[PDB]
Amino acid sequence: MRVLLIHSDYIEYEVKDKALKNPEPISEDMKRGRMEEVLVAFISVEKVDEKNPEEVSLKAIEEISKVAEQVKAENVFVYPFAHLSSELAKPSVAMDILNRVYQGLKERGFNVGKAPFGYYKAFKISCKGHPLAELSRTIVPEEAR
Amino acid sequence: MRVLLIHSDYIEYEVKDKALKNPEPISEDMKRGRMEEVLVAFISVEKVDEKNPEEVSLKAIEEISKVAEQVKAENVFVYPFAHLSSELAKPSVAMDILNRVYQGLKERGFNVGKAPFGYYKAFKISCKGHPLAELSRTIVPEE
Ligand SMILES: C[C@@H](O)[C@H](N)C(=O)N[C@H]1[C@@H](O)[C@H](n2cnc3c(N)ncnc32)O[C@@H]1CO
Ligand SMILES: C[C@@H](O)[C@H](N)C(=O)N[C@H]1[C@@H](O)[C@H](n2cnc3c(N)ncnc32)O[C@@H]1CO
């Protein structure tokens, strides 16, 4: 799994078209979404992650949470961003892992938002540009490294 | 080298303060910048790139140019983005490679912009969200 964390003044997205044959079911009101003063977590679930979804998800939850604490971000946004990596996990597994991370961040106490899975999405972001406002994290099963 | 390509309506940046002891010298006008209808190339020069700056630079220019062609963009913006990777190349080397890529793209005939090297920078971007609007590239020179 590759994660790109961006501490932002806001994140806004717009669904444009389906990117998969069967994307995550959503309502019309979800075709556009937005969150303020947020740590945006762009995530690409990799093939290697398929070896242990739970382990990877738990590690992602920990790493994202640690950065949110550091920058004092009360809001976190899980953004499916497949093309952050070249070797992708199959969609069904990617969705599963992203759901687990969302659930975990929620359980940690953060106000969590997310963008629909399986779509081509336009987005607008404004990175605060502070010391820890741009960070990347590589998370893989312990057996895979 | 790790490259994140974002086809965008615009890219705007604001230099905060230096993030290294000796950043690229800049004039007041270079502290801010904007480009529209542009393929933004966020680049992190990796330690592995130090082995062959010329090779990695040439491949990067080729890959970026190919994507620009695919998305039909004429504007390209080189954005130093160290945090796309964990194993960073030495700054002197990073700056040289970013400049080589910047110039290589200009040589292809593109309208190219670049943000200053060595600073903490705030930025705003708006991704088109069409197919190929978001692509990444891992360029590693074996020789
Ligand atoms: C396309 C671009 O604008 C948009 N932002 C997009 O990336 N869409 C992805 C994710 O929503 C999801 N998806 C599929 N596989 C994965 C994966 N391995 N990891 C994360 N997401 C995935 O399905 C879409 C196509 O890959
Ligand atoms: C900080 C963040 O907001 C800003 N956007 C930033 O990344 N600033 C980087 C690059 O401009 C440059 N830099 C240093 N090493 C590298 C490298 N290996 N590759 C690319 N750039 C580098 O030096 C600055 C501090 O690392």
UniProtKB/Swiss-Prot annotation, chain A:
Domain of life, source organism: Archaea
Recorded consequence of changing residue 121 to S: Isolated domain does not deacylate mischarged L-seryl-tRNA(Thr)
Annotated consequence of substituting residue 83 to A: Isolated domain has decreased to no deacylation of mischarged L-seryl-tRNA(Thr). Deacylates correctly charged glycyl-tRNA(Gly)
Protein's cellular compartments: Cytoplasm
Effect of residue 134 to A: Isolated domain has nearly wild-type deacylation of mischarged L-seryl-tRNA(Thr). No activity on L-threonyl-tRNA(Thr). Same results
Location of region: Editing domain: 1-143
Coiled coil: none
Signal peptide: none
SUBUNIT field: Homodimer.
Domain notes: The N-terminal domain (about residues 1-143) is an archaea-specific tRNA-editing domain that has a highly similar structure to Dtd (D-aminoacyl-tRNA deacylase); the domain binds L-serine and L-cysteine and most D-amino acids but not L-threonine. Editing of incorrectly charged L-seryl-tRNA(Thr) by this domain is tRNA catalyzed.
Protein function: Catalyzes the attachment of threonine to tRNA(Thr) in a two-step reaction: L-threonine is first activated by ATP to form Thr-AMP and then transferred to the acceptor end of tRNA(Thr). Edits incorrectly charged L-seryl-tRNA(Thr) via its editing domain. Deacylates correctly charged glycyl-tRNA(Gly), but neither glycyl-tRNA(Gly)(2'-dA76) (the terminal 2'-OH of tRNA(Thr) adenine 76 has been replaced by hydrogen) nor the 2'-fluoro tRNA derivative do so, strongly suggesting the editing function is tRNA catalyzed.
Similarity annotation: Belongs to the class-II aminoacyl-tRNA synthetase family.
Protein's name according to its UniProt entry: Threonine--tRNA ligase
Portion of the full sequence shown: 1 to 145 of 625
